[PDB]
Structure formats: C-alpha cells, structure tokens
Design an enzyme around this catalytic site. Structure first.
Site, PDB file in Angstrom:
ATOM      1  N   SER D 220      15.552  31.838  11.048  1.00  0.00           N
ATOM      2  CA  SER D 220      15.413  31.095  12.290  1.00  0.00           C
ATOM      3  C   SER D 220      14.673  29.814  11.956  1.00  0.00           C
ATOM      4  O   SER D 220      13.479  29.852  11.653  1.00  0.00           O
ATOM      5  CB  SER D 220      14.664  31.907  13.346  1.00  0.00           C
ATOM      6  OG  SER D 220      14.494  31.171  14.540  1.00  0.00           O
ATOM      7  N   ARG D 221      15.382  28.686  11.983  1.00  0.00           N
ATOM      8  CA  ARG D 221      14.778  27.414  11.617  1.00  0.00           C
ATOM      9  C   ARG D 221      13.820  26.883  12.671  1.00  0.00           C
ATOM     10  O   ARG D 221      13.084  25.933  12.388  1.00  0.00           O
ATOM     11  CB  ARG D 221      15.863  26.376  11.341  1.00  0.00           C
ATOM     12  CG  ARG D 221      16.566  26.568  10.013  1.00  0.00           C
ATOM     13  CD  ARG D 221      17.724  25.608   9.853  1.00  0.00           C
ATOM     14  NE  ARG D 221      18.601  25.999   8.755  1.00  0.00           N
ATOM     15  CZ  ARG D 221      19.735  26.677   8.906  1.00  0.00           C
ATOM     16  NH1 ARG D 221      20.136  27.041  10.111  1.00  0.00           N
ATOM     17  NH2 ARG D 221      20.471  26.989   7.850  1.00  0.00           N
ATOM     18  N   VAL D 222      13.803  27.463  13.870  1.00  0.00           N
ATOM     19  CA  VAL D 222      12.821  27.055  14.867  1.00  0.00           C
ATOM     20  C   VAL D 222      11.450  27.619  14.520  1.00  0.00           C
ATOM     21  O   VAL D 222      10.436  26.915  14.592  1.00  0.00           O
ATOM     22  CB  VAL D 222      13.284  27.473  16.273  1.00  0.00           C
ATOM     23  CG1 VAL D 222      12.114  27.558  17.223  1.00  0.00           C
ATOM     24  CG2 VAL D 222      14.301  26.485  16.792  1.00  0.00           C
TER      25      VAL D 222
END
Ligand SMILES: Nc1ncnc2c1ncn2[C@@H]1O[C@H](COP(=O)(O)OP(=O)(O)OP(=O)(O)O)[C@@H](O)[C@H]1O
Ligand SMILES: Nc1ncnc2c1ncn2[C@@H]1O[C@H](COP(=O)(O)OP(=O)(O)OP(=O)(O)O)[C@@H](O)[C@H]1O
Lengths: 247, 322, 131, 359, 120, 122, 72, 73
Positions: D220-222
């Site tokens: 999850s790049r967030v």
C-alpha cells in the site's frame, strides 16, 4: 521524457550548468513506445516490444552526456518486468546505465536511512584508474568487512560474539560501526527528523572511513557514528555519549 | 501449463533450500549443545581418573585381581560399534560400517571369534539386513544418549565381561576432530590398564593425544573447531585416604564408573560428530539447491520470453492473414 | 553447619549442597559420616544413601558408585543418582514384578548377572521410593 | 482512512479515502468477499458505495444484491450490472457509468467508494470490440490502448482539494490472475496504475486462513497515513511480530531444538495468524480490531490453545463492547489509543480471562 | 540395434548399457542436490558403473590430435563389446574412472590404470 | 459450501478435510527428498490421515464397474460425514491405507481392513 | 486408458484381470512413496513384491505374442 | 600468430592471422578491453586495425578513440 530532456539540455548548453535530469519509471517510457507502435500497426519485436526499442531508447539516452559546457547526469528509476534482468526493457536500459543504487527495505526499517544497499549497489566508476588507488582499496575493504559481517550474522546468532575469534569479533564491531556510519541526516529529511542535515564530500568520506576501519576509532560506541557525517562530528557525538556516562 | 509447472518446480526448490538451511542451523545449535554436554561431563571423569591413578599406585604391590583389569589372553574378541541415529549423516554411517567391515575381515581371518554390539540405528538396520554377522545387542537413539542409553550399554558390557565369556571388548566410534573430516578410531575398552588410561586396539596408550574439550570458533568468517591438550586437571596429589573398604574391593567398586564414563564420552563424541557431518551435508545441499534455483530461474525466464514471442507472432500472423 | 557434599553422576553435577548427617550404603555395610570427619575413602554399594538437611532427614536414590571423604569437602562419584524421591513406588512394583519374571526367563550365566544387577537396582529403587 | 472491516487489511494494508487499491487474486480466493465486507463495513460511515458487476452471471448479481438488502447496505449503495450476455460495448461502458455516478456524489462533497468487480472482463470486452473493428492487436490480442482504457478510468478516483469540497472516490478494482501469473498483461497494467495491491492466495485459502491475504507480497503506497492514531500504535507491533514469524516459519518443524526466544516468536506468530482469520460478511469495527491487535501483540493470548484463540477473542470483544463502552468511546471520539483505554482494556482482558477459565 | 541384425550378444550388452545409463539419468537430480552419500548400495554401484561407462564412451580421434593429443584410436566392434562386458560384469570395478577417459580398447584402460597407480 | 446453507457439522468436516489435504500437499517436498522417517510427530499423523482421506475419496461407480471391476455403491451424505469424521477423528488409525481404497462407506472400509488382515495372517 | 474397458475382454480375462489396472496404479504410487520411507510394514513389503513380480510379467518380446489362454 | 598481448589468450586460445575468433560474454565483462588490448598490441607488427562500434554509446567510443590516440595505435 524528450520534453524533460530538452528543458535539461537548455540548462546544460546555454548556461553551462551541471544538470540533474530525474526520470521517473523509464519502464513506462518503453511501455508507452510499445503502445504507440502497437497502435500504428508495426510488427512487434521479440517479447512484444516495438521493433524500434534500441533506437527509441538510444535517441533519449544519447543526449544525457557531458559537452564542453556542462553535463547532464540522469538518475532513472528502473522497473524490471517479471523481475528478470534479461527482459528487453531492462536488457536495453542497462546498456546505458553507468551505476546502480538499490534501496533496501531492510536498512529503511532498521533506521539506517538512506536505505541504499551497500553490497547490491554497483558502479563502473569504482576502479583504481578512475577513482584513485586509495579510494578503491578503502571501498573494497569496506565491502569485505560488510560481507564478512553478513556471513557471520548467523554464526553470532548461534554462538555469540564472545565465542568468535578475536579478529572476527574486531571485524564484527568494525562492520557494525560502518553500517551505522553509512547513514546520514538529510537537509530535506531535516523537517521531520530534526537533525540539521549534513553535506559530506568524498575526501572527508574516505578519511573518516580509513580511521573507522583502521584501529583508531575502536574505543567508541556504535551509536556515536549513527546519523552523522564528517567523522569529527562522530567523535563529538561520542564525547556527548561519554558525558552522559561521566554524569 | 508448462510455465506453471516450471513455476511450481522453482517454488519447491526454494522450499528445499529454506528447509536445508534450517537443518544446517539447527544442527549447528545441536553441535554446540553436545559440546556443552561434553564439557559438563568432563570434571566427573577428571576426578575419577585422578582418584583411580592414585589408588592404583597404592595398589600395584597388591592383589587387586578385579575382572576388569584382568587379562584373559585366550582372546575371544567383542567389537562394538556406535553409529548415527538419524539420517543423511554426510558420509558418517557409511565410513563407520565400512571400518567395521575392515575390522571383521581382519578378525574372522585370525579365528579370534569376533562379535558385534551395535548401538546406532543406521548401524543396527545395516546389521539386521546383512545377517551374515553375529550380533549381541541392539540399542537406539530414541532414548537419550546422555544418561540412560549409555548406562544400559555399560550394564550390558559389564555383564558381558564379568561372566567371563569374552575378552577384548573394543569400541569403534568417531571422534569429532574437524567439521569436514572425522576418521573413526578403534579403542579397546575392557582389558584396561590398571593405571586407568584408555588404549588403542593394540593398546599403545593413545590417551596421550586425546585432545579433550573440542570447541567451536570461526577462523576468518566460517566456523571451525579448536582442540587443545590439557585443562583443569589436578592428578598429582593424594593425601592419606584411610580406606574403609578392602583395597582390591575399592577398585572393584570403582572401575564400573570408568566403564560408564568412557562409554558416555564416546557416545557424546559420536553424537557431536554425526551432527557436524549433518551440518556440512546440509550446507552443501543448501548451496547446490541455490545454484539449482538460479539455473531454474534462468531457464524459466527464457521459456517465458519464448512463450510470449511465439504467442504474439502467431496472433499477428493470423491478423495479417485476414 | 556441616561438611560439604556433592553427588556427581557421569554427565552432570547433581547438587553441591551440604547436609548434616549422611548414612552411606557401602560394600562393607552402612556407615555414617560425622562432621569434621577424618578423610576416609569408602567404596559404595547399590543401596540407600540418606541425608540430614538439619531440618528433615531425607534419602538419595543412587545406582552404585564410590564416595570419597575430604576435609569437610567430600565427593560422591556414582553410576546413576536420583536426588530425593522422583518416581512413585507403584511403577516400581510394576517393574519389580517384571524383574522377578525376567530373572526366571533369563538364566544364562551372563543373563544371570544381568538379572541380578536388575534386582539389586530395582530393590534400592523401591526402598528409596519409600520416602 | 477507509475502514474495510478486515483487520488484516486495516492494520497491514491500510486503504485511505481517495486511494486506488487493487484486489488481485486467483479465482475463488475471496475477492468479491473482501469487496462485500467493505461495502457492509461502510454502514456507519456516510460513504456512498458503488458495485460494478461486469460480465457476471445474473444469479450471482442477484445473490449479491439480496445479501446487500438483507444486511441493510442497500440504502447507501448503487449496483451497476452488466451480465455476460450483454454486448461487449455495455460491459466496456459499465465501469465508466459507475465512475460517473460516483463522480456526481464526489463533487457534491460526499465520500464515495467504487468496486469494479473483474476489470479483466472489461478488458476482454474492449479487446473483443477492438478486434471486431479490425484494429492492430498487441500481446494477448489486446489493443495497444487497453492501458489507456484502465488508466483513464482509475485516475478518476481522487481526493479533492478542500476548495472543491473535500470529497473523494475510493476505487477498489478486482483483477483475476490465471495460474498465478502476476506478470500477465492486464494484471501488470493495473498493478502499475493502482496505488497498492492486495494479493490473495489459494494456498492460504485452502490452509484455512480466510480472508486469504498474502501480506508479505501486498503493498500500500499510501501507508500509515490511511490509519487513525489508535491503529498505528498496535499496527507497528503487529507488523514487526508477523515479519519475525515469516522469517522463522521455515524453523517451525525444528521448534523443539531452538532457543526459547525463537520458540516464543514462533508461537506468537502462529497465534497472531489465528486472529487474522475472519468469517465472510462480518466486518469488525475499528475499535474492536484495535483491541484485538493490542491483546494479540502484547501476549495476553500467549497462554491459550490455537483452537481457542478465536473463540476467546469473540467472547472478549462482546464483553468489552457490552461492559466497558468507555473504551469504544475513547477510541471513537479521540481516535487515539489513550492510556485510559489501555487500563480499561487490561481490566477487561483480566476479567474475561477469569470468566473464560471458568469455562 | 536388433538381435537378428547385430546378434544377441551385442544386443544384450547395448541393452544393459542403456539400462544402467537410464538409471543414472533418473537419479541424476537427486544426486545433484543431495549427493551420492544418500543412495543405496546398489544405486551407488550403478552410479559408479554408469560413470565408468560414460568415460569409456569417449575416444581419441585421428582428426582431433591437435585438441586432445594422445593420438586417435580405432576400436573394432568386438573390442567394444568385450570392454563393456568387462565393465558391467564387475571385473573392472576397483580402478579409477579416469583410466577409462579418452582411451580405446579397455586393455588400454587397464594399462592407464596401472600407469596411474604406479605414478601416484 | 457455506455454513448457513450446509450445516455446521458438514462445513467443519469439509474444512478439516481440505486443510489436511492442503497441509499434506505442502509437506510433499519436505517428504519427497528429506525422508518420511525424520518427520515430526504431528506431520506423520497428518501424512497418514491424508493418505487415508485420499484413498477414501475414491468410490466405485455403478456405471464404471467395467473399469473398476467391482460393483458400484451409492453413498449418502450423512454416511460420508460420519466416515470422514471417523477418519480424521483418529480412531481409524489402525486400518491399512488400502482398506480405504474404492469402498462405498466406512463399514465397507472396516470390512476390507478385516479381510486384508485375514489375507496377511493366513 | 481404455474407454471400452472389460467389455472388450472374454469372461476369463474379465475374471482374472478386472481389478488389475487400478491396483497396479495404486502399487505404483505406493512404491513411489516407499522410496523415502525408512522402516516398512510386512504387508507393504508384500504388496511391493507382488507389484514387482507383475511388472516383470508385463514384458514381451516384439513379434512374440501370447494367446488368450496364455494371457489368462 | 596474431599476438594479442594477453597471456591467457596467447597461451591457451592462440589466434592466427586469418581466423575468425568470437569474443562472447555478458555485459561489462570485458570484450572491449580485450579488443583494445589486441589493437594496442599491434604497434610493431605490420597490421592495419579496423574497429567497428555498431551500437555503443558515444562516450564509450570517445574513451576508446582517446585511448588509441594517446597510446599511439
Ligand atoms: N473470509 C472468508 N471466510 C470464509 N469463507 C470465505 C471468506 N471469503 C470467501 N469465502 C468463500 O470463498 C468462496 C468464493 O469466494 P468469492 O466468490 O468471494 O471469491 P471470488 O474470487 O470473487 O470468486 P470468483 O473467482 O468466482 O470471482 C465463497 O463460497 C465464500 O463463501
Ligand atoms: N583487464 C582489466 N583490468 C582492469 N579493468 C578492466 C579490465 N577489463 C575491463 N575492465 C574494466 O571493466 C569495465 C568493463 O569493461 P569493458 O569496457 O571491456 O566491457 P564492455 O565491452 O564495455 O561491456 P559492455 O560493452 O557490454 O558495457 C571497464 O570500465 C573497464 O575499465
């Protein structure tokens, strides 16, 4: 990408500056080219890429050079499809790369930002003829020390540092301090880490590593080298960590 | 479905590498624990050998005539062999059983009436499947070799001897002297010198180069062993001990302790040597599975590129044909 | 308040704690060692060795051995020692019945000695499991 | 944060409002299940939900919509359905009408959620019409603008700018891999386009662990910015301990002859895996999963048996939610794991351990 | 390769050679990962015999005297049949594998083994 | 195969059978090279019960008595649940693996076990 | 495989070789699994022996056939 | 002989005038260092050298040509 390269070539050529051209994922440049060729109806190359893969790549990579005026240096993020370095996007990207920096989740997690892997990063510049025999030998000795540490991590996990030989224990301590000295506070990461950030040229780099690698800085803690630059700052942090003990 | 079965073969090779390095590391831990066991069982035998040396010096002019020091030169022979309990052993059990074949081939010639006591599991399986050999008892490594296995062995061999049916109970085991190499030795056990020194198959006092208390230390970045000569031994002094028991019966009640201690020491040494052979074998197997995983990944990338190429070439051939 | 006492089995030191009065099951007969004893080296039989904690008189279960008396620092080298009571006597009678059974079965001159040692050790197993 | 109700998602792969997270997995691994649990978990929140059923069987859409009406998630949901008898044009257009509806609600200051179930079917429909219009194909006969098809759709999922209304549209596309080929064409396209990916494994699904999330490969790049402050504290320890368990997992067959710390980490990981299991259509509230992660990661369940961890945790969550509503209120209003909440939770853990050892 | 064309002795020797080579090829991957130490006694004997066979298959050529040296050998059919009967029959079972590598006419393999043992 | 449709007993026995077969499939390469003897105590029981389950999943069909050479059998659902619950309960650990091959129900498994024991003794 | 099965056999061959293909496949799987088994049962060794005797019986020289009674 | 100057080549892979010898390897494993060694070794011999750079980056050609010019080849 050609738009960015034109904006960078102006700064090189007209102003005689040293330009730093950052490309985002250069895999998506190749992928967009394969898209436009599949749209124009051309017959694809080997693994489905456009037939003009090497020439499309070269027309971009051949303007990131150094003239008599300045020099554009590019730092291109590279995605490897299917994680194989033999796919035609990495196989032709790597025909134009001079050096390589791998960023490691391990060092990022254990707090040793910048998280560059010291052993899986390469450079064709790191040769005696190019960088000086002293620089080459100190870099090789640091790589040997880190490799020995990585090979001895499991043995010290089983036995312990008290059960290794004397030279291997000295190696383990030196490599611990080296791994902690590769870290650096950033002028940009200052805003959330708080540490004022440092710029460390190459001369102070090799002179600090020579001292930490020879038996001069062996009577210091590990956390005296962590998140500093310029080994004199490491001795100053050491004196502070010793003031915490004399107090 | 060829690419998927290639992916699954590569995954099984990755699992094989992971489990072989796990076996290597746990065998290294068990080698360290066997070394701890040896150094903890050391001082018992240290005090025993100093007491026995002093007492024999007080008894050389005497008539000790214990069955254990007595010599019955009619020379029947009882070879006993300890072998690896578990498997894959590097080449432990093969060399052990092979030297057993060598000894029995020399012995059955001379008519010395050899016989075999097998202690390990691979050994006794070999011996039951090769029924042409006389055998005296069976033992196993399910029971711990620390106390009860070796005590049962000492009981069996003591009752074998004091009922004077056989002479020359000698032992074949494999002393842990080095990681990659461990050559078996034949030491005589029961026709023991009154001084209290372990001997060889002939008896030329090989207690001189026994090199007690092996320990594990790395050399440059790889684990080795280091074996020195003499540690924490005070055999010289003997005060007025003012015996309450009979001077010969003192040795009669003492020497079974020497028998048990020597058997237990041999079991601990052969256990450490078996685990070291396992560690080096699993290191080799991890490295071989590593290079196999590399070759498999290369061949799979080639197959994947060839599959993609052929598929797209076929699609475009059909489209252009339309 | 008493002489030091240590029992050593072939692999481990059992316990290096001292107890006041100790009765020794020897080959010549049960003898007791008094504190500040003169050094006498005695052989030990497969029997009952009992201690005196100066708080409670307790027994040790040993499978034979040989004990030396020092200047209040004595050593007891055994074949197999069980400190105090560890097994209950019920399994010990379930084992003595097989002991007397296999004596009847095994009658070879070497098995004679095997079963005789099995009896001599099972008996002291029980008479040490008494407490 | 966009709460999905699945503890292994919200702690390890957190999704935020405005983020495009990929639900990628093999067939029958639980992709539609994760989507439905998220739509049901949006019950308390004021999140307009959109489910786009592309090329599905009509009875499947019937079951999904009747499940929605049953659990009450139909008052804030819209269902766009283009079954597999539809023309290719309708199955290619359906996600864009879903996105248009969610864009209406997004620009009217509301927070929305859109699930594109089997975007691979939309790619195959677009490939069908592209081939029938006689266009030059590419890899797997896909037109060269299938990436444009998917990216032009996924970039609509935004988090607006506080002068456009603070609204957002979270996109949860679903991509089905074949034979575990994550390097396939459309999966690589959507993996390149989306913010993160959430991988499901058939081996994990068969082994019992449901939902069959492969956290070691899901990203999850967030990051933790898609969490509340009470969840990051416990998620740190959950991450560290699950990582150590993944390291030592090959040593589980040699657990007996290992160090006590290694055996402890192995048992800890193997009973942290038990609290990642979760039944279908039963999403947990954020306070319930915070208390679950806290208990598991601190080791107030390192004494029970693995066949009892789940039952103990169900009884414990009910016990806390009924007896100590102050913990729910602390975690809900302040959104942080306050020391007073820790005290209430330790008291409830002690009391529930006594009541559970009463059998 | 049929018993009616090449005779029964040639046919049976070729069949036995191919059988031991096939057994070796089968257990190749197991002995590649693990090694020879784990095989049974009969499997180890088959491995050693298959290795001697695959060494006795090589031969010096007259046209390749520049590459190998040790000038080429012409081997008739009867000599090949006798040499493989000797290998598979267990007679030549206690001599180095390298005695068979790049020779003809297994009497030369025995000469090479004697030379190697006397040279040490 | 959902609990609310199929019943908790059916759902749980199906889940346990599937987990035992998956665990056996994942143990396959640690068996196939490293040795079935050195295995732990729990994995040996897993392997045994999974081989028994694999044999018991087979069944002779009425239409396939030309292939199996044996008469076919119809097995109701309750007898299936009871047979698999017996197998992975641990009380059928004494029957040979081949006693579970091509049998209708679990009483046929026990009868075939008895017959095999008789053939092995006399 | 044979899709027609024992219907393409005389009653003698149906009687003696009806259950043979499935038991031969089961023996093949058993013999595969017993390669990495150390200790064996007596019934397992007997099944292995029967399978190997049958596998030796299965061999035939080319253009050297058996009749139906020889096959039985 | 066509001497390259490299001991390993001239000892074990000897090359004569008129032979097509392939230099095959990975990337950055040599082959251009080897080619330039063979060209710089022709100073005394009466041998014309041709070097075709078919797809190299322009900086690699620059380095090769300046090395040639400096060393006199
Ligand atoms: N968390 C869970 N717990 C128990 N069962 C589950 C869970 N998630 C999914 N399942 C079961 O898995 C089966 C398939 O699930 P689902 O249809 O959601 O996966 P899918 O990948 O969307 O299927 P398809 O591949 O057909 O699209 C269903 O029967 C469902 O009951
Ligand atoms: N014999 C050598 N000694 C020292 N350094 C060498 C030697 N051979 C090559 N190198 C160094 O290795 C690097 C790569 O060598 P070289 O230029 O021969 O390969 P290359 O043909 O450029 O590979 P590619 O063209 O695929 O990039 C060069 O920078 C060179 O400095």
């Amino acid at each position: 990408g050609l738009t960015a390269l034109t904006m960078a070539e102006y700064f090189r050529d007209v102003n005689e500056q040293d330009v730093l051209l950052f490309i985002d994922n250069i895999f998506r440049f190749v992928q967009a080219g394969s898209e436009v060729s599949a749209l124009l109806g051309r017959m694809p190359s080997a693994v489905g890429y456009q037939p003009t893969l090497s020439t499309e790549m070269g027309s971009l990579q051949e303007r990131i050079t150094s003239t008599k005026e300045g020099s554009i240096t590019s730092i291109q993020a590279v995605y490897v499809p299917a994680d194989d370095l033999t796919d035609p996007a990495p196989a032709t990207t790597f025909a134009h790369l001079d050096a390589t920096t791998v960023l490691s989740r391990g060092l990022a997690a254990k707090g040793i930002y910048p998280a560059v892997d010291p052993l899986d990063s390469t450079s064709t510049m790191l040769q005696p003829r190019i960088v000086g025999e002293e620089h080459y030998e100190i870099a090789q000795r640091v790589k040997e020390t880190l490799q020995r540490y990585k090979e001895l991590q499991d043995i010290i996990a089983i036995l312990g540092l008290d059960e290794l030989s004397e030279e291997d224990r000295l190696t383990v301590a030196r490599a611990r301090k080296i791994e902690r000295f590769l870290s650096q506070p950033f002028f940009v990461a200052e805003v959330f880490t708080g540490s004022p950030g440092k710029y460390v040229g190459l001369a102070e780099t090799i002179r600090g590593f020579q001292l930490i690698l020879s038996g001069e800085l062996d009577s210091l803690p590990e956390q005296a080298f962590y998140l500093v630059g310029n080994i004199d700052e490491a001795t100053a942090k050491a004196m502070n960590l010793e003031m915490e003990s004399k107090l | 479905a060829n690419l998927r079965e290639l992916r699954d073969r590569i995954g099984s090779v990755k699992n094989t590498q992971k489990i072989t390095e796990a076996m290597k590391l746990v065998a290294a831990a068990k080698v360290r624990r066997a070394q701890e066991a040896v150094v903890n069982g050391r001082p018992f035998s240290e005090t025993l050998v100093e007491v026995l040396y002093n007492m024999n010096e007080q008894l050389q002019t005497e008539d000790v005539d214990v069955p254990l020091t007595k010599i019955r030169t009619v020379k029947k022979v009882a070879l006993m062999v300890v072998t690896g309990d578990r498997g894959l052993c590097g080449g432990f059990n093969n060399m052990l059983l092979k030297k057993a074949e060598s000894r029995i081939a020399e012995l059955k010639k001379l008519g010395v009436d050899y016989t075999i006591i097998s202690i390990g599991k691979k050994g006794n399986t070999y011996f039951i499947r090769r029924p042409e050999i006389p055998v005296d008892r069976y033992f196993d490594g399910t029971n711990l070799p620390t106390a009860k296995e070796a005590q049962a062995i000492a009981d069996d061999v003591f009752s074998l001897f004091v009922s004077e049916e056989v002479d020359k109970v000698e032992m074949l085991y494999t002393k842990f002297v080095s990681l990659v190499k461990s050559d078996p030795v034949i030491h005589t056990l029961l026709p023991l010198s009154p001084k209290g020194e372990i001997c060889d198959i002939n008896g030329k006092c090989v207690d001189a180069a026994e090199d007690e208390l092996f320990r594990l230390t790395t050399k440059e970045g790889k684990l080795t062993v280091e074996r020195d000569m003499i540690k924490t031994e005070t055999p010289a002094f003997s005060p007025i001990l003012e015996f309450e028991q009979d001077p010969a019966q003192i040795l009669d009640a003492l020497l079974p302790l020497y028998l048990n201690s020597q058997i237990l020491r041999a079991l601990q040494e052969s256990l450490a040597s078996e685990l070291a052979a396992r560690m080096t074998a699993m290191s080799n197997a991890t490295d071989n599975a590593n290079e196999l995983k590399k070759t498999l990944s290369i061949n799979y990338n080639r197959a994947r590129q060839a599959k993609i190429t052929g598929e797209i070439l076929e699609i475009v051939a059909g489209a252009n044909a339309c | 308040m008493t002489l030091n006492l240590c029992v050593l089995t072939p692999n481990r030191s059992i316990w290096n704690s001292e107890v006041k009065e100790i009765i020794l099951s020897t080959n010549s007969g049960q003898i007791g060692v008094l504190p500040n004893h003169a050094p006498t080296a005695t052989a030990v039989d497969i029997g009952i060795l009992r201690i005196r904690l100066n708080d409670q008189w307790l027994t040790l279960a040993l499978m034979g051995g040989f004990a030396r008396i020092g200047n209040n620092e004595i050593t007891i080298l055994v074949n197999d020692a069980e400190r105090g009571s560890d097994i209950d006597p019920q399994e010990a009678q379930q084992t003595l019945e097989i002991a007397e059974a296999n004596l009847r079965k095994a009658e070879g001159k070497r098995q004679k000695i095997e079963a005789n040692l099995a009896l001599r050790r099972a008996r002291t197993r029980v008479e040490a499991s008494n407490t | 944060p966009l709460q999905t109700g699945l503890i292994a998602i919200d702690a390890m792969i957190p999704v935020g409002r405005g983020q495009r997270e990929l639900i990628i997995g093999d067939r029958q691994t639980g992709k539609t299940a994760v989507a439905t649990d998220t739509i049901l978990n949006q019950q308390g929140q004021n999140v307009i939900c959109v489910y786009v059923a592309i090329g599905q069987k009509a009875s499947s859409v019937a079951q999904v919509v009747t499940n929605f009406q049953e659990r009450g998630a139909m008052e804030y949901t819209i269902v766009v359905a283009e079954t597999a008898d539809s023309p290719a044009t309708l199955q290619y257009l359906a996600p864009y009408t879903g996105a248009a509806l969610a864009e209406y609600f997004m620009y009217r200051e509301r927070h929305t959620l859109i699930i594109y179930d089997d975007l691979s079917k939309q790619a195959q429909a677009y490939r069908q019409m592209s081939l029938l219009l006689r266009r030059p194909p590419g890899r797997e006969a896909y037109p060269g603008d299938v990436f444009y098809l998917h990216s032009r759709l996924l970039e609509r999922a935004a988090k607006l700018s506080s002068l456009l209304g603070e609204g957002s549209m979270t996109a949860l596309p679903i991509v089905e891999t074949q034979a575990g080929d994550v390097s396939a064409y459309i999966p690589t396209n959507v993996i390149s386009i989306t913010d993160g990916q959430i991988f499901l494994s058939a081996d994990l699904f068969n082994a019992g662990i449901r939902p069959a999330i492969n956290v070691g490969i899901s990203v999850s790049r967030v990051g933790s910015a898609a969490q509340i402050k009470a969840m990051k504290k416990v998620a740190g320890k959950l991450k560290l301990e699950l990582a150590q368990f993944a390291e030592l997992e090959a040593f589980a067959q040699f657990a007996s002859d290992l160090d006590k710390a290694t055996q402890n980490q192995l048992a800890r990981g193997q009973r942290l895996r038990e609290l990642l299991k979760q039944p279908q259509s039963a999403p947990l509230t954020v306070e319930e999963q915070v208390m679950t992660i806290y208990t598991g990661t601190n080791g107030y369940l390192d004494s029970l048996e693995l066949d009892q961890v789940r039952k103990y945790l169900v009884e414990l969550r009910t016990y806390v939610k009924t007896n100590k509503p102050e913990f729910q209120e602390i975690i809900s209003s302040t959104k942080t794991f306050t020391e007073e909440a820790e005290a209430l939770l330790k008291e409830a853990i002690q009391e529930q351990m006594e009541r559970f050892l009463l059998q």
